[PDB]
Design a protein around this ligand. Structure first.
Ligand SMILES: Nc1ncnc2c1ncn2[C@@H]1O[C@H](CSCC[C@H](N)C(=O)O)[C@@H](O)[C@H]1O
Ligand SMILES: Nc1ncnc2c1ncn2[C@@H]1O[C@H](CSCC[C@H](N)C(=O)O)[C@@H](O)[C@H]1O
Lengths: 378, 384
């Protein structure tokens, strides 16, 4: 490690008005725990916090107790800098490998381990230790690299290792020239469209990548349940953009895991698996999202972070479009309080069975596209 | 669904198209040290519908023996045999595993797109080796790992959806291909696969189980495991840095520093459109002087450059199949002296009698013809 990765953040007041952490409960509480309001007083473990992550969580959740572990002293030294600068009294730092988490003698409501577990000798033993740190209703939020999104990186990485390249300036120069000489069609060009991030990606040894089924098997091997994805978009047919496709109908017939497995092989830009795991003894009503049954009509749709409606447009982060007038009518009634049944009711005052059906299908489609989350009954 | 697509008429097909490993076209690549021989003994090991008939049609004085496990495939070779009077074509329903029953060896053994379909590809290559004369060549094609990513991705999806060879599966398969995002690895492959959406070729690629693909190192190991020498590539372009288009690249210099096989292995991972390994294998006891091409030695000055099929010079342009460009004036001067008779030394001599001493021009000639040999523009004739 020639430079610190990730790149150290100087000021969280600047960073947090512009950016956000995926698994920050301030933003993502309803995705982790669909059945409850934001809780400001969570016990949060950041397992492999690197330079910035734990300090961000402690800054945005001032009343939360944040415990952070890393094996890197320089990484923890930057968390300490951010701790001292911003008075993060709620942040506790340890030089500790994931393997020794039991030495903390604590369990947690949220365990975040993003971009860490592959660097372990035994990723399965790592996930087992995260599982043992989890309260009944707690969630492990994890990131692994995805096999089919990382093809380009693995190709160039392996070439750089066969040429004996390291982290020196001469190796970085050769590495950039190689990337500049890639033909237009090389798989790495799609991935590309930061000397520290270049070194971490290309010149820091092979980084294990995972299929959907390997992610699920890692989670179940640790005695945990695969709760689901942070971003659903990569893992489902986008039937909202392409309705009435017989091929997408045949994919939506398969059991969830086999269906995700198919879409990973058709949607190959996505290069990370962001997923949630929880305990077998967490009641399934807390987190089970199933738009196929009558219970879905009690789901309360809410706009996800940086999503919503502006006039006749619906927006995601960095993408806008005009839905059909009949679709917009449903989206205008999303307030984070009304149920799908209630929303169909409000549209009907502008059959009921047909509108409830259209509502259920629409919110299913937009949940799979990361436009709405759902609040489940308490 | 016969694959490959049956050809109706070889008189029409052969004026427009050609087989890579047809000795009429490619004799100097298989045997650099000798002229075309019209009377070769040729084995087509897994001939499919067309290939053996084409070889027999273009080499009328050659004895062509063809084997396949598919009766319908051999039935089309027979149709072509009867239509064109290919008395020099002998057909057998015989697996490669039972080749020894024919009790014959051959000057040329062609096995293109066949060996992966075997239970034991290495036992297949061993049986081809056992039927090869001292100076004979095995011309083989295996699918390449990094060029076939797209095919393997969609193939595996179709198997997980339980799709077969029925009309309903072919319709779903075409719709799936239409729904692939622009960046899907299969899309670049589809741009160069002219005939792949035809029902026969679609089924063969996507709906008839996984076809094993190979890295450069797996091809070389398959050949050496059978007790053969890896002679080289039919097309060198995929396996070398294109220093003719990008001279003085420090990265390409570092790749050209590696041992040959590791260097080929690197270029396979940088040049990922190429989806087939077309290579030649020969016996360890074939004299190395017959086929060894090494532009780094003084012997290279005695190499006779020859234009490869559908390559040459018209005025100030040089052409490949499907690509034209203007070389530097000093490059053109060398290319205008390629006649398939003059050596690299002689060519430098002719340029010198028209920006360099003799030593400098011989050096420029050696480097230029090395660059263009690696780009499949010139073959070389070696001394007898
Ligand atoms: N066994 C182990 N236990 C804990 N941390 C580890 C570890 N092996 C590697 N790490 C750390 O894991 C981190 C991965 S980099 C990712 C940092 C942070 N999770 C983020 O999302 O920004 C590095 O800081 C590395 O030092
Ligand atoms: N064990 C075996 N021995 C001989 N042929 C075999 C075989 N297994 C498969 N084949 C045949 O190999 C062929 C591969 S298709 C390629 C056809 C031809 N070589 C060409 O290049 O156009 C098929 O016809 C298939 O039936």
């Amino acid at each position: 490690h020639r430079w610190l990765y990730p790149h150290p953040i100087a000021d969280l007041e600047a960073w947090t008005t512009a950016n956000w952490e995926w698994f920050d409960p301030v933003h993502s509480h309803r995705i982790l725990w669909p059945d409850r309001e934001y809780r400001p007083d969570l016990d949060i473990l950041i397992a492999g916090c690197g330079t910035n992550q734990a300090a961000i969580f402690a800054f945005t959740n001032r009343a939360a107790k944040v415990v952070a572990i890393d094996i890197s002293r320089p990484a923890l030294d930057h968390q300490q800098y951010l701790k001292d600068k911003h008075g993060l009294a709620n942040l506790e730092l340890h030089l500790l490998p994931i393997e020794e988490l039991a030495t903390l003698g604590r369990d947690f409501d949220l365990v975040v381990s993003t971009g860490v577990l592959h660097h372990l000798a035994d990723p399965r033993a790592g996930m087992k230790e995260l599982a043992h740190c989890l309260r009944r209703d707690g969630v492990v939020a994890a990131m692994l690299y995805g096999k089919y999104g990382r093809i380009g990186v693995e190709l160039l990485g392996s070439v750089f290792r066969d040429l004996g390249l390291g982290q020196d300036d001469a190796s970085i120069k050769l590495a950039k020239e190689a990337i500049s000489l890639l033909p237009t069609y090389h798989p790495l060009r799609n991935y590309l469209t930061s000397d520290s991030a270049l070194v971490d990606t290309f010149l820091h040894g092979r980084q294990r990548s995972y299929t959907v089924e390997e992610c699920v098997d890692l989670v179940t091997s640790a005695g945990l349940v695969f709760q689901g994805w942070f971003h659903k978009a990569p893992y489902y047919p986008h039937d909202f953009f392409v309705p009435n496709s017989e091929f997408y109908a045949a994919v939506n017939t398969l059991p969830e895991v086999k269906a995700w497995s198919v879409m990973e092989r058709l949607e190959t830009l996505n290069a990370t698996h962001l997923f949630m795991a929880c305990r077998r003894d967490r009641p399934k009503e807390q987190y089970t999202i199933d738009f196929s049954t009558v219970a879905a009509l009690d789901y309360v749709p809410l706009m996800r972070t940086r999503c919503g409606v502006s006039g006749t447009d619906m927006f995601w982060p960095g993408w806008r479009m005009a839905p059909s007038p009949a679709q917009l009518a449903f989206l205008q009634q999303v307030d984070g309080r009304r149920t799908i049944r209630e929303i169909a009711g409000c549209v009907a005052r502008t059959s009921l069975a047909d509108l409830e059906e259209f509502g259920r299908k629409l919110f299913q489609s937009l949940w799979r596209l990361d436009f709405v989350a759902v609040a489940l009954p308490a």
